[PDB]
Amino acid sequence: GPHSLRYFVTAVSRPGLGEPRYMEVGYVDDTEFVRFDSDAENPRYEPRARWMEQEGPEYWERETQKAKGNEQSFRVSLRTLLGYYNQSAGGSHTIQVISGCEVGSDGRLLRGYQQYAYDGCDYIALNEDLKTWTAADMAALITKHKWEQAGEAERLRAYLEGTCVEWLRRYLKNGNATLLRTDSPKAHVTHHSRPEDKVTLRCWALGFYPADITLTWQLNGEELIQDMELVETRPAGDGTFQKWASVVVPLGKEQYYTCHVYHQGLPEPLTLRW
């Protein structure tokens, strides 16, 4: 299926406490594989997935140097934004960026993207065509004009169609045993009492990969999607994911509800009852 290379970058100022904290976390699909944290003793880009051991020492030196340069770039961005927004230098502010590309099953580019946020709100984003930016406000419009005159769109587009795609292919190749695998979810249902003379039924799905999955509760063959509760799919510490979905049903009527689990590792969807 399709795959993605994504980088989450965060820069947070902290007046009176020194320089901004700068962090970079990279993911190949839903798997973390690289990281940089300026708050480390000896800040360096480091592997987060076993297969990254296949990259030589120069990879780490190169990326470490790149990270240090980005940190400085964002530190200046933080300062610049105080000017655009005319804000005081005594407050903490945050800049966020998602940058990445996605390829199809054949390793061919499907889409590229890079979006910014300042203090939790859209700032500037590259359009689908990878040729122009769209600014959320007048501050971002200034950035848009600067970047346009600097030819940034062209430089970013070259990265997204080239560098980004080429390295993603390499990452998928080197870590194929990890990234191309499929772990089937194991499911079970828990039961809990309620005051109102009814019960809570919770469907659990464990140890699966990739992260995408669907959990539903059915009655009379129809999905109760609406009246149920759930949590977002979450990592379980070993590279796999888990999720749960619950529904409140009338005591004694439990056997009338069934849980459905759809996943890449489930040839036929799982159906469970309590």
């Binding site: 980088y7 970079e24 980005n70 200046v76 961005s77 610049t80 800049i95 500037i124």
Partner: peptide, 8 residues
């Protein structure tokens, strides 16, 4: 690999 950014 990561992209090389320049200030906003």
């Amino acid at each position: 690999e990561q992209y090389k950014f320049y200030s906003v």
